[PDB]
Design a protein around this nucleic acid. Structure first.
Ligand SMILES: [Mg+2]
Ligand SMILES: [Mg+2]
Lengths: 489, 497
DNA sequence: TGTCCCTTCGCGTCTCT
DNA sequence: AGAGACGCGAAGGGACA
DNA sequence: TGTCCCTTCGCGTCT
DNA sequence: GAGACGCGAAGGGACA
């Protein structure tokens, strides 16, 4: 109770009583809250756990941790208890939407601003509630909402943006800055020898915001002339968060990396056109000679690994783990590169290192299969999900390990496996598909929505044959099923 | 003081006489055509070049030679084609068909030389494809349109927000240079002062006379929307055609005359005006409605329907002339005459029914109803003549019933579908095992020809993107959405995989 | 007049759902 | 299949040399 | 310092 | 294979 106990002691005391219901927090969730919301947020969570989880709020422990774990966490926790009922009962927002709004730094501010501005933004011929929630669901959500309120009319009338484009620009961290900068720089950027309005909107909408736009304004002429890049390549580099950083890094490193038998400008653009393109470029500069000597990789492979987001993390992890993977696990350098060459390459590699024994011994997969699974984006998720669901998919649903590996071996493998698990019985028992056909559908990128679109059109239809529908689902997934509505209708 | 043109006419007739012989064998129509547009010098150039064009290494058909010759400067275009056709086909990768297409307009020489000179910079420095460059070149003033596209493509995309496709669409009309410069000047005025989207502006600009239509929408939009009570959408719709300027001015004149004196709505007036020759259709309605509706004759709504299409004026006058004979001597109802008249080329279809209804019925065993159905689409004349031509071979050689032939014929582009079925049915059925019924079903839709061609393309040079579909699935798709469905499916597979 | 360019009208075909 | 979009050719005027 | 806001980076999924 | 989209984590400046 009431004392001047020190910070850590205060924390561990609050944590002590937070081990059981309604909210049993672990060390992980505790640390998570501490790192952003602080001991303040931990104390808030303690103080309010019963009200937060009880009626009529009924928030889960996960939702509570999600709100608590940001700067101003206590403020957001206090504010949602007030405003969730209001926003839900008076404005028809879902609790999920309200929690989404609250789960950012300064969430209190965003929630209060949605309360105030939702009635003025969502009048006739205005924004949809969904658009308002999207805009509010970022740090500085209040600033973004007030700025859309202000500049929506001039951006649409004077510059001819659609409301949808204005929302796209606004729906990022620093959205207020992106909107004001678009409004200022459109005229200057969109002249002969500049960018198209479409390109400026892309830059403003992809997360690099104000910084990326100002840096393009500044560096376009020299990057396009002295550095020989096309405007399109400059826009590609700028069209990520931290675009400014990547652009300045390309300006600095182009005359380094593009020397005799170095990289091409196109290779440099490729490396830089990812989140953290700066880190990826600098790491290529630093590690290309050593990965090629020590670990036997080629410059082409190094560029391949660098050419995704998490480039730096993947390159450093290859440098660190290629030996053990090759020796303690008998993989080849080409296999390690294949696992590394995706978003999350680092995670994929560490998960292969951790999980390859249990999967090959206890589950009887081949290292080749494990590598196949790991060699996509989200590879870590796919590995862990195969570990989790292999036995239930094979035992209860009658699949072969080969089929499970097939479902797992694309981007979104986790989602595909979980969806197959959900929907295999209804597709087979109610609509007469085979497990082979379900597996066929699931075994592509976009497997999950392909399966959901097919169970949708099969449960209540608007016609091609079922086999034709399965064939379309395999060929182009959900988009194929939707694009055939745009005809038969 | 003899007529000055006497010697010229005489020379013309001498050479023209000589051209009926090998290796060209021009008929009277072709010769007349060439004289009328290319002139005596064009006829003479055809004579002098006959051997160089016919066989040699060009292998132009006589129809192609006639198409190049029959324009202002046709002599020049003939010289330039024999010079640049090989250059453009092997240095730039164009087909001879594309080269002839570029050649076949006034100032064809200019267009060919400008394509030779600018195709590289337009494809490399500007990102255009050769198809797009050929499309821009393939109109009168094509040289001007190409140079203007080069000059203005960046400022139209960057300063004004157009896509390259939009710029190409604007440029790909006679007077394209004029339309491009006008869009440059007027897009901000039309968009910001009047609330038009750039899409509406491109739509107005993308016709022959684009510049005239844009300047006229600028001038008349305020008067038409405030006073006459038209919406901007309706004004854009009127403007969005060749002779847009003439249509808009005529709508301003005749809107209140038509509404007050005949009880038309503004929407009906807009519909009449929103065709090529909208002006003509309006003036003819004002003139002819009382006559046609006379003695409880046609109803006003019927007159409006006839006028609400392309060649409105021609259709109205032809109906005035031919309703009696068609109804009396041929036994059509006036309802059927109206249906036949209510399409682009209504006049042509009416005349062709008058001529071919007795033959198609007696010689080919069709009903008048079948003849009317064939006639009652755009290009009805072409479909009727094609049915006359191909009914015997489609039935006797390919096993189709007359009912099937009629169904193929009874859509827009029916001539095309019929000719393409005649051409492709043997390979579709014998070589790939489609049934005649499946071929007939694919062809019995608007766009039947390209749907059939898409299908044959996929069966003879399989694209991996479509291999997951069986022949029957390909058929169902082709029936549902024609070539566009097939093409859209390819893209879907590319993204998804 | 020969040649180039532009506008208007009539007519024919395909696409979009 | 109803409405809109796409697109070819004939034919006349301006312009100039 | 905690709260707010903006920027940058890593990662996962779908087209 | 590349590119678009969007979630969450972290770092740091302003500020009262
Ligand atoms: Mg990938
Ligand atoms: Mg003339």
């Amino acid at each position: 109770q009431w004392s001047g106990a020190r910070a850590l002691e205060a924390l561990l005391t609050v944590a002590g009583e937070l081990r059981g219901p309604p909210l049993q927090l672990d060390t992980g969730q505790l640390l998570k809250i501490a790192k952003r919301g602080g001991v303040t947020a931990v104390e808030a969570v303690h103080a309010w756990r019963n009200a937060l989880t009880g009626a009529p709020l009924n928030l889960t422990p996960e939702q509570v941790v999600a709100i608590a774990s940001h700067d101003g966490g206590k403020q957001a926790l206090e504010t949602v208890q007030r405003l969730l009922p209001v926003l839900c009962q008076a404005h028809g927002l879902t609790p999920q939407q309200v929690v989404a709004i609250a789960s950012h730094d300064g969430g209190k501010q965003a929630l209060e601003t949605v309360q105030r501005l939702l009635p003025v933004l969502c009048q006739a011929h205005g924004l949809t509630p969904e658009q308002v929630v999207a805009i509010a669901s970022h740090d500085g959500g209040k600033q973004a909402l007030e700025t859309v309120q202000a500049l929506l009319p001039v951006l649409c009338q004077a510059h001819g943006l659609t409301p949808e484009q204005v929302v796209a620009i606004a729906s990022n961290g620093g959205g207020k800055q992106a909107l004001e900068t678009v409004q200022r720089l459109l005229p200057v950027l969109c002249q002969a020898h500049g960018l198209t309005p479409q390109q400026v909107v892309a830059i403003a909408s992809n997360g690099g915001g104000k910084q990326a736009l100002e840096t393009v304004q500044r560096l376009l002429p020299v990057l396009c002339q002295a550095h020989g890049l096309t405007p399109q390549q400059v826009v590609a580099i700028a069209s990520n968060g931290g675009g400014k950083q990547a652009l300045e890094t390309v300006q600095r490193l182009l005359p380094v990396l593009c020397q005799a038998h170095g990289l091409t400008p196109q290779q440099v653009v490729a490396i830089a056109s990812n989140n953290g393109g700066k880190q990826a470029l600098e790491t290529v500069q630093r590690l290309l000679p050593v990965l090629c000597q020590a670990h036997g990789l080629t410059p082409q492979q190094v560029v391949a690994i660098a050419s995704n987001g998490g480039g730096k993390q993947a390159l450093e992890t290859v440098q660190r783990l290629l030996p053990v993977l090759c020796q303690a696990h008998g993989l080849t350098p080409q296999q390690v590169v294949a696992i590394a060459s995706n978003n999350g390459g680092k995670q994929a590699l560490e998960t292969v290192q951790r999980l390859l024994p249990v999967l090959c011994q206890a589950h009887g997969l081949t290292p080749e299969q494990v590598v196949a699974i790991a060699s996509n984006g989200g590879g870590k998720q796919a590995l862990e999900t195969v570990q989790r669901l292999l036995p239930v998919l094979c035992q209860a649903h009658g699949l072969t390990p080969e089929q499970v590996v097939a479902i797992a071996s694309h981007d979104g493998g986790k989602q595909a496996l979980e969806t197959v698990q959900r929907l295999l019985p209804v597709l087979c028992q109610a609509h007469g598909l085979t497990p082979q056909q379900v597996v066929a559908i699931a075994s592509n990128g976009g497997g999950r929505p392909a399966l959901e679109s097919i169970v949708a059109q099969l449960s209540r239809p608007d016609a091609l044959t079922n086999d034709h529908l399965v064939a379309l689902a395999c060929l182009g997934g959900r988009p194929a099923l939707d694009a055939v509505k745009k005809l038969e209708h």
